[PDB]
Coordinates of C-alpha atoms in Angstrom, one line a residue:
Chain N
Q1 CA 0.0 0.0 0.0
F2 CA 3.1 2.1 0.1
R3 CA 5.6 1.3 -2.7
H4 CA 5.4 -1.7 -5.0
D5 CA 8.3 -4.2 -4.8
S6 CA 9.5 -2.6 -1.6
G7 CA 11.4 -5.7 -0.5
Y8 CA 13.9 -5.2 -3.2
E9 CA 17.2 -7.1 -3.2
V10 CA 20.8 -6.0 -3.7
Chain E
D1 CA 12.0 11.3 8.5
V2 CA 9.5 12.8 5.9
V3 CA 6.8 14.8 7.7
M4 CA 3.4 14.5 6.0
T5 CA 1.2 17.5 6.8
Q6 CA -2.5 17.2 5.9
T7 CA -5.1 20.0 5.8
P8 CA -7.7 20.6 6.7
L9 CA -8.2 18.6 10.0
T10 CA -11.9 18.0 9.1
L11 CA -13.9 18.9 6.0
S12 CA -17.8 19.1 6.1
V13 CA -19.4 18.9 2.7
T14 CA -23.0 18.7 1.5
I15 CA -24.0 15.7 -0.6
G16 CA -23.4 16.6 -4.3
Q17 CA -20.8 19.3 -3.5
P18 CA -17.0 19.0 -4.2
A19 CA -14.3 18.1 -1.7
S20 CA -10.6 19.0 -1.8
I21 CA -7.9 18.0 0.7
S22 CA -4.2 18.8 0.8
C23 CA -1.1 16.7 1.7
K24 CA 2.3 18.3 1.8
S25 CA 5.6 16.6 2.3
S26 CA 8.7 18.0 4.0
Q27 CA 10.9 16.4 1.2
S28 CA 10.4 15.5 -2.4
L29 CA 8.6 12.2 -3.0
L30 CA 10.2 11.9 -6.4
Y31 CA 12.1 8.6 -6.4
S32 CA 15.2 7.7 -8.5
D33 CA 13.0 5.7 -11.0
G34 CA 11.0 8.8 -11.9
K35 CA 8.0 7.7 -9.9
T36 CA 6.4 9.5 -7.0
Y37 CA 5.2 7.0 -4.3
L38 CA 2.4 9.1 -2.8
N39 CA -0.7 7.1 -1.8
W40 CA -4.2 8.1 -0.5
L41 CA -6.0 5.8 2.0
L42 CA -9.6 6.0 3.3
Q43 CA -10.5 4.5 6.7
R44 CA -14.2 4.1 7.1
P45 CA -15.8 3.8 10.6
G46 CA -14.9 0.4 12.1
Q47 CA -12.7 -0.8 9.2
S48 CA -9.1 -1.2 8.2
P49 CA -7.6 1.5 6.0
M50 CA -7.9 0.9 2.2
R51 CA -5.9 2.5 -0.5
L52 CA -7.8 4.6 -3.1
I53 CA -5.0 6.2 -5.0
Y54 CA -1.4 5.3 -5.7
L55 CA 1.5 6.9 -7.6
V56 CA -0.2 10.3 -7.0
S57 CA -3.0 9.9 -9.5
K58 CA -3.7 6.3 -10.3
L59 CA -7.0 4.9 -9.0
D60 CA -7.1 1.6 -7.3
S61 CA -9.5 -1.1 -8.6
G62 CA -13.2 -0.3 -7.9
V63 CA -12.6 3.3 -6.8
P64 CA -15.3 5.7 -8.3
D65 CA -14.1 8.1 -11.0
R66 CA -15.3 10.9 -8.7
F67 CA -12.0 10.6 -7.0
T68 CA -8.9 12.3 -8.5
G69 CA -5.4 12.6 -7.1
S70 CA -2.9 15.2 -8.3
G71 CA 0.3 17.0 -7.4
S72 CA 4.1 16.7 -7.7
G73 CA 7.2 17.0 -5.6
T74 CA 5.9 18.0 -2.2
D75 CA 2.3 19.3 -2.8
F76 CA -0.5 16.7 -3.3
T77 CA -4.3 17.0 -3.5
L78 CA -7.2 14.5 -3.4
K79 CA -10.5 15.8 -4.9
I80 CA -14.0 14.4 -4.9
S81 CA -16.0 15.9 -7.7
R82 CA -19.4 15.3 -6.0
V83 CA -19.5 13.9 -2.4
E84 CA -21.7 10.9 -1.6
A85 CA -22.7 9.8 1.9
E86 CA -20.6 6.6 1.6
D87 CA -17.4 8.7 1.1
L88 CA -17.3 9.6 4.8
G89 CA -14.3 8.6 6.9
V90 CA -10.7 9.6 7.4
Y91 CA -8.5 10.2 4.4
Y92 CA -4.7 9.6 4.9
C93 CA -1.8 10.3 2.7
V94 CA 1.2 8.1 3.1
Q95 CA 4.6 8.3 1.3
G96 CA 6.6 5.3 0.3
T97 CA 9.5 7.0 -1.4
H98 CA 11.7 7.4 1.7
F99 CA 12.3 5.0 4.5
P100 CA 10.7 5.0 7.0
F101 CA 7.3 5.2 5.3
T102 CA 5.3 8.0 7.0
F103 CA 1.6 8.9 7.1
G104 CA -0.3 12.2 7.3
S105 CA -2.5 12.7 10.4
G106 CA -5.7 12.4 8.4
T107 CA -8.6 14.5 7.2
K108 CA -12.0 13.5 8.5
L109 CA -14.7 14.0 5.8
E110 CA -18.1 14.7 7.4
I111 CA -21.3 14.9 5.5
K112 CA -23.7 17.9 5.8
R113 CA -27.4 17.3 5.6
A114 CA -30.8 18.7 6.8
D115 CA -31.5 18.9 10.6
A116 CA -33.0 15.8 12.1
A117 CA -34.4 15.5 15.6
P118 CA -33.2 12.4 17.6
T119 CA -35.4 9.5 18.2
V120 CA -35.3 9.2 22.0
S121 CA -35.8 5.9 23.9
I122 CA -35.5 5.4 27.6
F123 CA -35.1 2.0 29.3
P124 CA -35.5 1.0 33.0
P125 CA -33.0 -1.2 34.8
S126 CA -33.4 -4.8 33.8
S127 CA -34.8 -7.3 36.4
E128 CA -31.6 -9.2 36.1
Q129 CA -29.5 -6.2 37.0
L130 CA -31.8 -5.2 39.9
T131 CA -31.5 -8.8 41.1
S132 CA -27.7 -8.3 41.5
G133 CA -28.0 -4.9 43.2
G134 CA -27.4 -2.4 40.3
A135 CA -29.6 0.0 38.5
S136 CA -28.5 1.5 35.1
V137 CA -31.0 3.6 33.3
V138 CA -30.2 3.8 29.5
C139 CA -31.3 6.4 27.0
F140 CA -30.6 6.3 23.2
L141 CA -30.8 9.5 21.2
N142 CA -30.6 8.1 17.7
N143 CA -30.2 9.3 14.1
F144 CA -30.0 13.1 14.7
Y145 CA -28.2 15.9 12.8
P146 CA -26.2 18.0 13.4
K147 CA -23.8 16.3 15.8
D148 CA -24.1 18.6 18.8
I149 CA -26.9 17.3 21.0
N150 CA -26.8 16.9 24.8
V151 CA -28.6 14.8 27.4
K152 CA -30.2 15.9 30.6
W153 CA -31.4 13.4 33.2
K154 CA -34.1 14.0 35.8
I155 CA -35.1 11.8 38.8
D156 CA -38.5 12.6 40.3
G157 CA -38.3 15.8 38.3
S158 CA -34.9 16.9 39.7
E159 CA -31.8 17.3 37.5
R160 CA -29.0 14.8 38.1
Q161 CA -25.5 15.2 36.7
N162 CA -23.4 12.6 38.5
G163 CA -23.2 9.0 37.4
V164 CA -23.9 9.9 33.7
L165 CA -21.7 8.3 31.0
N166 CA -22.1 9.1 27.3
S167 CA -20.9 7.6 24.0
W168 CA -21.4 8.7 20.4
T169 CA -21.3 6.7 17.1
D170 CA -19.4 7.8 14.1
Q171 CA -21.5 9.4 11.3
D172 CA -23.8 7.0 9.6
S173 CA -22.8 6.3 6.0
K174 CA -26.4 5.7 4.8
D175 CA -28.4 8.6 6.3
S176 CA -25.5 10.9 7.4
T177 CA -26.8 11.1 11.0
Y178 CA -25.3 10.7 14.4
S179 CA -26.4 8.7 17.5
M180 CA -25.7 9.0 21.2
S181 CA -26.1 6.7 24.1
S182 CA -26.4 7.9 27.8
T183 CA -26.4 5.7 30.9
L184 CA -27.3 6.9 34.3
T185 CA -25.8 4.5 36.9
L186 CA -27.6 4.4 40.2
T187 CA -27.4 2.0 43.2
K188 CA -30.5 -0.3 43.5
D189 CA -31.3 1.5 46.8
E190 CA -31.2 4.9 45.1
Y191 CA -33.3 3.7 42.1
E192 CA -35.9 2.2 44.5
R193 CA -36.1 5.5 46.5
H194 CA -37.6 7.4 43.5
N195 CA -40.3 6.8 40.9
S196 CA -39.9 8.9 37.8
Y197 CA -37.0 8.9 35.4
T198 CA -36.6 11.3 32.5
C199 CA -34.1 11.5 29.6
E200 CA -34.1 14.8 27.7
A201 CA -32.4 15.6 24.4
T202 CA -31.2 19.2 24.8
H203 CA -29.4 21.8 22.7
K204 CA -27.0 24.6 23.5
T205 CA -29.4 27.0 21.9
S206 CA -32.9 28.2 22.8
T207 CA -34.7 25.2 21.3
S208 CA -37.4 22.8 22.4
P209 CA -36.2 19.6 24.0
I210 CA -37.3 16.0 23.2
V211 CA -38.2 14.1 26.3
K212 CA -38.9 10.5 27.3
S213 CA -39.9 9.2 30.8
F214 CA -40.9 6.1 32.7
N215 CA -42.3 5.4 36.2
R216 CA -41.2 2.6 38.5
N217 CA -44.7 2.2 39.8
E218 CA -46.7 2.0 36.6
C219 CA -46.4 1.7 32.8
Chain G
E1 CA -9.7 -14.8 -2.5
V2 CA -6.7 -12.9 -1.0
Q3 CA -7.1 -12.8 2.7
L4 CA -4.9 -11.7 5.6
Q5 CA -6.2 -13.3 8.8
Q6 CA -4.6 -11.8 11.9
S7 CA -4.4 -13.1 15.5
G8 CA -7.4 -12.3 17.8
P9 CA -7.2 -9.6 20.4
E10 CA -4.7 -10.0 23.2
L11 CA -4.3 -9.1 26.9
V12 CA -0.7 -9.1 27.8
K13 CA 1.2 -8.0 30.9
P14 CA 3.9 -5.3 31.0
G15 CA 7.4 -6.7 30.6
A16 CA 6.3 -9.7 28.7
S17 CA 7.0 -10.3 25.0
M18 CA 4.2 -11.6 22.7
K19 CA 3.6 -12.6 19.1
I20 CA 1.0 -11.4 16.5
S21 CA 0.3 -13.6 13.6
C22 CA -0.9 -12.8 10.1
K23 CA -1.9 -15.8 8.0
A24 CA -1.8 -15.2 4.3
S25 CA -3.9 -17.1 1.7
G26 CA -5.0 -16.9 -1.9
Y27 CA -1.6 -15.9 -3.4
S28 CA 2.0 -16.9 -3.6
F29 CA 3.3 -16.0 -0.1
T30 CA 6.9 -15.5 -1.1
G31 CA 5.9 -13.2 -4.0
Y32 CA 4.9 -10.1 -2.0
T33 CA 6.4 -8.0 0.8
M34 CA 4.4 -7.8 4.0
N35 CA 4.3 -4.6 6.1
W36 CA 3.2 -4.0 9.7
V37 CA 1.5 -0.8 10.9
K38 CA 0.5 0.5 14.3
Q39 CA -2.6 2.6 14.9
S40 CA -3.0 4.2 18.3
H41 CA -6.5 5.2 19.6
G42 CA -8.0 5.0 16.1
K43 CA -5.9 8.0 15.2
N44 CA -2.3 8.2 14.1
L45 CA -0.9 5.5 11.8
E46 CA 2.8 4.5 12.0
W47 CA 4.8 2.2 9.7
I48 CA 6.7 -0.4 11.8
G49 CA 8.6 -2.3 9.1
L50 CA 8.5 -4.8 6.3
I51 CA 9.6 -8.3 5.5
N52 CA 10.1 -10.0 2.2
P53 CA 9.2 -13.7 2.8
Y54 CA 11.2 -14.9 -0.3
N55 CA 14.6 -13.5 0.6
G56 CA 14.2 -12.6 4.3
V57 CA 14.9 -8.9 3.7
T58 CA 13.6 -7.1 6.8
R59 CA 13.6 -3.3 7.2
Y60 CA 12.5 -1.5 10.3
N61 CA 11.4 2.0 11.2
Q62 CA 14.2 3.0 13.7
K63 CA 11.5 4.0 16.2
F64 CA 10.6 0.3 16.5
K65 CA 14.1 -1.2 16.5
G66 CA 14.3 -3.3 19.6
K67 CA 10.5 -3.2 20.0
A68 CA 9.3 -5.3 17.0
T69 CA 10.8 -8.4 15.4
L70 CA 9.5 -9.6 12.0
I71 CA 9.7 -13.2 10.9
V72 CA 7.9 -15.4 8.4
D73 CA 6.9 -19.1 8.4
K74 CA 6.9 -20.0 4.7
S75 CA 5.7 -23.5 5.4
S76 CA 2.4 -22.0 6.8
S77 CA 2.3 -18.8 4.8
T78 CA 2.2 -16.9 8.1
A79 CA 3.9 -13.6 9.0
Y80 CA 4.7 -13.0 12.6
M81 CA 5.5 -9.8 14.6
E82 CA 7.1 -10.2 18.0
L83 CA 6.5 -7.2 20.3
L84 CA 9.2 -7.1 23.0
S85 CA 9.4 -5.7 26.5
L86 CA 5.8 -4.6 26.4
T87 CA 4.7 -1.3 28.0
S88 CA 1.4 0.6 28.3
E89 CA 2.2 2.6 25.1
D90 CA 2.3 -0.6 23.1
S91 CA -1.5 -0.8 23.5
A92 CA -2.8 -0.3 20.0
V93 CA -4.3 -1.9 16.9
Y94 CA -1.6 -3.6 14.7
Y95 CA -2.2 -4.3 11.1
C96 CA -0.3 -6.5 8.6
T97 CA -0.5 -5.4 5.0
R98 CA 0.5 -7.1 1.7
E99 CA 2.4 -4.9 -0.7
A100 CA 2.2 -4.9 -4.5
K101 CA 4.9 -6.6 -6.5
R102 CA 4.0 -5.2 -9.9
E103 CA 2.8 -1.6 -10.1
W104 CA -0.7 -2.8 -11.0
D105 CA -1.1 -5.2 -8.1
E106 CA -3.8 -4.8 -5.5
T107 CA -2.7 -4.2 -1.9
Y108 CA -4.4 -5.7 1.1
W109 CA -4.8 -5.1 4.9
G110 CA -5.5 -7.6 7.7
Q111 CA -8.4 -6.9 10.0
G112 CA -6.2 -5.7 12.8
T113 CA -5.2 -7.1 16.2
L114 CA -6.1 -5.1 19.3
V115 CA -3.4 -5.4 22.0
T116 CA -4.1 -4.3 25.5
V117 CA -1.0 -4.1 27.8
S118 CA -2.2 -4.3 31.4
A119 CA -1.7 -6.1 34.7
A120 CA -5.4 -6.4 35.3
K121 CA -7.3 -9.7 35.2
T122 CA -10.0 -10.5 32.6
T123 CA -13.6 -9.7 33.7
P124 CA -16.5 -11.0 31.5
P125 CA -19.4 -8.7 30.7
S126 CA -22.7 -8.7 32.4
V127 CA -25.3 -8.5 29.6
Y128 CA -28.7 -6.9 30.3
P129 CA -31.7 -6.7 28.0
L130 CA -33.2 -3.3 27.5
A131 CA -37.0 -3.1 27.0
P132 CA -39.3 -0.1 27.0
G133 CA -40.9 1.1 30.2
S134 CA -44.2 1.9 28.5
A135 CA -46.7 -0.6 27.2
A136 CA -47.3 1.1 23.9
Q137 CA -46.1 4.0 21.8
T138 CA -46.9 5.9 18.6
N139 CA -43.9 5.2 16.5
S140 CA -44.2 2.5 13.9
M141 CA -40.7 1.3 14.8
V142 CA -39.7 0.2 18.3
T143 CA -36.2 0.5 19.7
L144 CA -34.7 -2.2 22.0
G145 CA -31.2 -2.6 23.4
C146 CA -28.6 -4.4 25.3
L147 CA -26.3 -3.1 28.0
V148 CA -22.9 -4.8 28.0
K149 CA -21.6 -3.9 31.4
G150 CA -18.3 -4.1 33.3
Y151 CA -15.9 -6.1 31.2
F152 CA -12.1 -6.0 30.6
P153 CA -10.3 -5.8 28.2
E154 CA -11.8 -4.7 24.9
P155 CA -13.2 -5.9 22.6
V156 CA -16.7 -7.4 22.7
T157 CA -18.7 -8.3 19.6
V158 CA -22.4 -7.6 19.6
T159 CA -24.9 -9.0 17.1
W160 CA -28.7 -9.2 17.0
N161 CA -30.6 -12.4 16.3
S162 CA -27.2 -14.0 15.5
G163 CA -26.6 -11.4 12.8
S164 CA -29.9 -11.7 10.9
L165 CA -30.9 -8.3 12.4
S166 CA -28.2 -6.1 10.9
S167 CA -30.1 -3.0 9.7
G168 CA -31.1 -0.3 12.3
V169 CA -28.4 -1.2 14.8
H170 CA -26.3 1.3 16.7
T171 CA -23.5 -0.3 18.8
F172 CA -21.8 2.5 20.7
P173 CA -18.1 2.9 21.8
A174 CA -17.4 1.5 25.2
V175 CA -16.7 3.9 28.1
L176 CA -14.2 3.1 30.8
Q177 CA -15.1 3.5 34.5
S178 CA -13.6 2.0 37.6
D179 CA -11.3 0.0 35.4
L180 CA -14.1 -1.7 33.4
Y181 CA -15.6 -1.1 30.0
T182 CA -19.3 -0.7 29.4
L183 CA -21.1 -0.3 26.1
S184 CA -24.6 -0.4 24.8
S185 CA -26.3 -1.5 21.5
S186 CA -29.7 -0.4 20.2
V187 CA -31.8 -2.1 17.5
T188 CA -34.9 -0.7 15.8
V189 CA -37.5 -3.0 14.4
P190 CA -41.1 -2.6 13.0
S191 CA -43.5 -2.3 15.9
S192 CA -45.7 -5.0 14.4
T193 CA -42.9 -7.5 14.9
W194 CA -42.3 -7.0 18.7
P195 CA -42.9 -8.6 21.0
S196 CA -44.6 -11.2 18.8
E197 CA -41.2 -12.1 17.3
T198 CA -38.2 -12.7 19.6
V199 CA -35.3 -10.3 19.6
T200 CA -32.0 -11.4 21.2
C201 CA -28.6 -9.8 21.5
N202 CA -25.5 -12.0 21.2
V203 CA -22.4 -10.8 23.0
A204 CA -19.0 -12.4 22.7
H205 CA -16.0 -11.5 24.8
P206 CA -12.8 -13.2 23.5
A207 CA -10.6 -12.5 26.5
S208 CA -12.9 -14.4 28.8
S209 CA -14.0 -17.0 26.1
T210 CA -17.6 -16.1 26.8
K211 CA -20.6 -15.9 24.5
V212 CA -24.0 -15.1 25.9
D213 CA -27.5 -14.4 24.4
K214 CA -30.1 -12.2 26.1
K215 CA -33.7 -12.2 25.0
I216 CA -35.5 -8.9 25.1
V217 CA -38.5 -9.4 27.4
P218 CA -41.4 -6.8 27.6
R219 CA -42.2 -5.0 30.9
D220 CA -45.1 -6.5 32.8
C221 CA -47.9 -3.8 32.8

């Protein structure tokens, strides 16, 4: 509800 | 952290009229991918928040086209072209560009409508409660408008202010009214000492009351 | 469809630690990040942190570092939040939410979990039926009610006729007095149906595992 794909990897 | 400042605190709008509410951020919400992660939520009475708008202006599935979001950078706006009673609740903006994600403090949308007198109902203590030594007298003042109504209690015709607890519902999304409940808590011994119990719907203006009474000794 | 089913309400003592669960279903659990949100007093919303169940990435709001721990159980598609070293200010409603993966994905919220931090014991409500003190009236609708008195902690759940009476109900916010909550509920029915047809309020109080029904009985006149 805040930012899509927020659990992005590095 | 990004501070999200919403104005106004509350907005009161007649059905059919427009609504506009503002959300300003203390930092740009433009992310490095060119997108601006500004969202609008609506929290209706008794429910979890639900997103209406994302990426500033995109409507979530099912949201009426009466809702539009706009803005850029640090200044954002949610508009309702014509307000419907079901739109009431608290609108929050929330930013997802910067960690930690942060919310505005909300704008409560309230519906304006014609005056409505409360339906007043008074209830004696139950036999079950009297059995156990208590005596709560309950009064409902239901489906009125506008929100500012008061209650006055009388016992044997004399005003009583102690032992009175009140609660109010949120605005009704079908008829845009308000309701209030008032409980006068007495001991069984005090309740049995008197006969007549009166609940009055009052106003802070020179206006006629709406009264309901019962008698312990007769119906 | 997609559902986020959270733990029921909890009473917990200060200084304990306790777990909230969020059971996800209807979607690929590891395909979406989960967030947790605190709402105090039905007012301000605060983002606690997120967890990506696929890769274990876990980001916290620094405010909640050392207060919240986020884990997932992929085997059961369940997200967990541990709240540590509980104090009175941890009393609140906590939500889990499912984030979008693609831009066009829907987002979802759980129903919320009400946490009450207190040393007090549980007290079940006393439920009293509310019937008019008059024998008759003018209005073509009659209002009845139930007083749900002296319970702790919140919440209770009030229904009428096991939920078949849903229109015309006002269930009011509870008031706190002498360390107990009291609320009331009103229902308004056609006068031609009462008292010929029975009206009952149903009151559940999870913390005391109690469920009671009270039939509205007319005054004897």
